[PDB]
A paper describes a structure:
Bisphosphoglycerate mutase (BPGM) is an erythrocyte-specific multifunctional enzyme that is responsible for the regulation of 2,3-bisphosphoglycerate (2,3-BPG) in red blood cells through its synthase and phosphatase activities; the latter enzymatic function is stimulated by the endogenous activator 2-phosphoglycolate (2-PG). 2,3-BPG is a natural allosteric effector of hemoglobin (Hb) that is responsible for decreasing the affinity of Hb for oxygen to facilitate tissue oxygenation. BPGM is a multifunctional enzyme, functioning as a 2,3-BPG synthase, a 2,3-BPG phosphatase and a phosphoglycerate mutase. The phosphatase activity is responsible for the hydrolysis of 2,3-BPG to 3-phosphoglycerate (3-PGA), an intermediate in the main glycolytic pathway.
To confirm the binding mode of 2-PG to BPGM, the crystal structure of BPGM complexed with 2-PG in the absence of 2,3-BPG was also determined to 2.48 Å resolution. The overall dimeric structure is identical to that of the ternary BPGM·3-PGA·2-PG structure. Similar to the ternary BPGM·3-PGA·2-PG complex, the monomer A active site of the binary BPGM·2-PG complex was ordered, with continuous electron density from Ser2 to Val254. In contrast, monomer B was disordered, with weak or missing electron density at the C-terminus beyond Ile245 and weak or missing side-chain density for Arg100, Arg116 and Arg117. The carboxyl group of 2-PG forms hydrogen-bond interactions with the main-chain N atoms of Cys23 (2.6 Å) and Ser24 (2.5–3.5 Å) and the guanidino group of Arg100 (3.5 Å). Our ternary BPGM·3-PGA·2-PG crystal structure shows a terminal snapshot of the catalytic phosphatase activity, with one subunit undergoing catalysis by tightly binding to the substrate (fully closed conformation), while the other subunit binds 2-PG with a partially closed conformation of the active site in monomer B. The binary BPGM·2-PG crystal structure confirmed the ability of 2-PG to bind to the active site and the presence of an alternative noncatalytic binding site at the dimer interface.
Numbering used by the authors:
A (entry chain B): 3 to 245
B (entry chain A): 2 to 255
Write the structure that this text describes.
C-alpha cells in the first residue's frame, strides 16, 4: 500500500458572510488559522512525518499548510503550489451573497450550481467587481497555460479535468516513490481527487461531504487506485457542522 | 547583464537575547524577530518588489522570516526552496555558550577572530554536547547531497563557502541568469561567505563585514555574476549603522 493526506482550509470572512470566494484570494480568519493550527497539533499527536506538501496558489490554502508545518516542526519540508488545485471558478457568482442569489433565481438553481458534477455557472466577465483582481494578478501570468486559456467558470467536472494532469505528472510519481505527501486544497479540488481515486460516480460525488480543518487519510495500491473509503483522523469529537 | 538580488539575515530569537551561539540549533524567532521580518516585507513592498523565487536554509528562523515577508507582499504563492547549504556557520563546541563570557575567558580579540575570521575553525562539537543528538538525529539532514556522517562538526568561514558555493553555482545563479528576481533568507555567516565570493573580498577584509539583522541587502551583478559595487543596505542610514555597532558589541565587555 501507500498512504496520502489531503485536507481543506478553514473559515474566512466571506465563509461567514455566506459568499462565494472561489478564485478570490481571500485570507483566513482567527478560526481559520486556529483550525489549521489544531489540525497540525492532531497530525503531531499522530506522529505524522511528511516529505512533500502540495497546495493551490490561493493563500488560504498556503497559510494552512504553513501553520500545519509549524505545529509539526517540519518547516523545511518542500512545498509546491499550482493553480490546478484552486477552488472551483464560480464565474459571475464570485463574491455575491448566496442566500440572496437564491432570492433572484431560486433555491433549485443555486443548489444545482453547487451540487452538480456537470453544470457550469455563468462566466465572469470584465464588468465583474473582481475580474481584474483575478486575471491581472501576476500569479496567473507564470502558469503552465496562458492567461486567456484559463477558465472563466468551471463545473465540478471541469475541476477534475484540469486537476488530473497535475496528479498524473507531479504528484502520482512521488506517492509512487514512498514520499508521505500532504495535499492542502479546497472543497471542490479535494472532492474531485477523491472521485478519481475512489472511482466515485458522476452522481455519488455531489453527495460527498468533507469537513474542514480535518485530515483525510486515504490508502492506495500499486495501481494508485483506492483501497477503501476516505477516513478522518484525529479526535473523532470532530463530527460537527455539515450545515 | 545587470542583475539585482535581495539577501537578508533573520531577526531576534530567545538565545539572541541571551547572547548565546545558535548555529545549527533550530531556535525559533521571538516575536520581535517576527516584526523585523514584517518590517522587511513592508519596505520591500514599498519598493514594489515582485519575487519569482525564494531560497532559505533548513533552520526554521530563516524559513519563517521568508514566509512572513511573502505574506506582507501578498506573494505567498512564490516558490520557496530550502537547503542546509545556506545554514548558519556550525560553531562547534561554542554552540549554546554566551558571547560576553567567551570574551572574558579568552579576550575580545579571540572572540572576534572566532566570530568573523575566514580560516579559524571552532572547536568541534562532541557527543557530550547537550544539543549533539538533536542536531545530527534530525530527519531534515537525512535525504541530502552528502552523507549524514559527513556533515561538519565545526566550520570556518571558508568551510561555509566551500559548502554554499556549489548551491549558488547550480541552483541560485542559473535562476538569476534566467531573469528571475531572487530573495535569499539566510544568516550572518552564510550571507557573508556569498558576499565574499560575489564581491571578491580578501581573506583579510571579510573580517570587517558585520551584517545587521532584519535588513534587506541589495546586490547588483554583471553578466559574469560578480558584484557591480559593494552590497547596499535598504533602510535608514543611521539606524543601520547603529544596528551594526550593536552586533559587534555582543563580543565586547563592560
Amino acid at each position: 500500500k501507500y498512504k496520502l493526506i489531503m485536507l481543506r482550509h478553514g473559515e474566512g470572512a466571506w465563509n461567514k458572510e455566506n459568499r462565494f470566494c472561489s478564485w478570490v484570494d481571500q485570507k483566513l480568519n482567527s478560526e481559520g488559522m486556529e483550525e489549521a493550527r489544531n489540525c497540525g497539533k492532531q497530525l503531531k499527536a499522530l506522529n505524522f512525518e511528511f516529505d512533500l506538501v502540495f497546495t493551490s496558489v490561493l493563500n488560504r490554502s498556503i497559510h494552512t499548510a504553513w501553520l500545519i508545518l509549524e505545529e509539526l516542526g517540519q518547516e523545511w519540508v518542500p512545498v509546491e503550489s499550482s493553480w490546478r488545485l484552486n477552488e472551483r471558478h464560480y464565474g459571475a457568482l464570485i463574491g455575491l451573497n448566496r442566500e440572496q442569489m437564491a432570492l433572484n433565481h431560486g433555491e433549485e438553481q443555486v443548489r444545482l450550481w453547487r451540487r452538480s458534477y456537470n453544470v457550469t455557472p455563468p462566466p465572469i466577465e470584465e464588468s465583474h467587481p473582481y475580474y481584474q483582481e483575478i486575471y491581472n494578478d501576476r500569479r496567473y501570468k507564470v502558469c503552465d497555460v496562458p492567461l486567456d486559456q484559463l477558465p472563466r467558470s468551471e463545473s465540478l467536472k471541469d475541476v477534475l479535468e484540469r486537476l488530473l494532469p497535475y496528479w498524473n505528472e507531479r504528484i502520482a510519481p512521488e506517492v509512487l516513490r514512498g514520499k508521505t505527501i500532504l495535499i492542502s486544497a479546497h472543497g471542490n479540488s479535494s472532492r474531485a481527487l477523491l472521485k478519481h481515486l475512489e472511482g466515485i460516480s458522476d452522481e455519488d460525488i455531489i453527495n460527498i461531504t468533507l469537513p474542514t480543518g480535518v485530515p483525510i487519510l486515504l490508502e492506495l495500491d500499486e495501481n494508485l487506485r483506492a483501497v477503501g473509503p476516505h477516513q478522518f483522523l484525529g479526535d473523532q469529537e470532530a463530527i460537527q457542522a455539515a450545515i
